[PDB]
Amino acid sequence: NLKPVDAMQCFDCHTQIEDMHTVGKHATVNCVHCHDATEHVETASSRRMGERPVTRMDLEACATCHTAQFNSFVEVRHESHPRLEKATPTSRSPMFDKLIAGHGFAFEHAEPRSHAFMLVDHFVVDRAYGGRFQFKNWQKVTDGMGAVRGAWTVLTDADPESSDQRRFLSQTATAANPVCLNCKTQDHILDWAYMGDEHEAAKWSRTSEVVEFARDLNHPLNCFMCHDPHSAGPRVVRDGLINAVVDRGLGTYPHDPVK
């Protein structure tokens, strides 16, 4: 069973978090629900991290207290046809192959399906990783909860001993790069600098080897993408959006300064 930690002690070095956590609707939610910081607290100073504390990115970290929202999220809409190619006469773009010729989407561009699958679908689509990643078998395509538990519980890698983007199947492309993943997961939220710029503190960036990056990512559409875990308040985390709205001054509604 979880044992609460002394959050006040954390706050002696984490004023920024203190100011969010103490005020919001998660003021009573102990840090142990999402962090394992025991060795960190033994080794840190206010100016030296010491041992890096663990931060949980899994959606079940929130499901314990918010099962209704979690279960509603993970539901699979079976009526949303899966792996349905758009470049067919009965889908969105009957002449897509002629029109898009020269682009990687020619290799495959399916209609979207339920959010639970976003990361796995990104990994397995024919245009992304040269067919490197596949469902473990064709039964796994139904397993929304499994995908949410983690991509690598339901997928395989054709060659764990290499990290290069290459084609494993003939009619695939290797369009995936690290930026893609920002719209599939935010497991890397503490390992990626704003915009994916190079940064001494970032394990991952725009220029990383995407296959290596992929292997470190597990969960789709994290709950905290819209909800700050500390304040419980509404937010966004996607760098490109913040860059447009704030950095570039365009605002949240570029056509309506009042709104």
5: its two tokens = 């930690």
Q: Which does 61 bind (CB under 5 to 8 A by kind): a copy of itself, Ca ion, ligand HEC, none?
A: ligand HEC
User: Which own/partner contact pairs does 153-161 have at CB distance under 8 Å and 24+ positions apart?
Assistant: 154/120, 155/120, 155/123, 155/124, 157/132, 157/133, 157/215, 158/131, 158/132, 158/133, 158/134, 159/132
Q: What are the phi and psi torsion angles at 134 (to 5°)? A: -145, 155
Instruction: Map the footprint of ligand HEC across residues 124-153, applying CB under 6 A.
Output: 125, 128, 137-139
Nearer to a copy of itself, 33 or 215 (CB): 33
Is residue 10 annotated as involved in ligand binding? Answer: yes
Q: Write the binding mask 94 to 113 for Ca ion: x where contact by CB under 5 A, - elsewhere.
A: -----------------xx-
Nearer to a copy of itself, 6 or 164 (CB): 6
- Residues with Cβ within 8 Å of 208's Cβ and at least 6 positions away in sequence, in order, are 178
Instruction: Map the footprint of Ca ion across residues 112-151, applying CB under 5 A.
Output: 112
3-state secondary structure of 100: helix
Using CB under 5 A, list all residues that contact Ca ion: 80, 111-112
Task: Tell me the binding residues for heme.
Answer: 10, 13-14, 26, 31, 34-35, 40, 62, 65-66, 115, 180, 183-184, 223, 226-227, 230
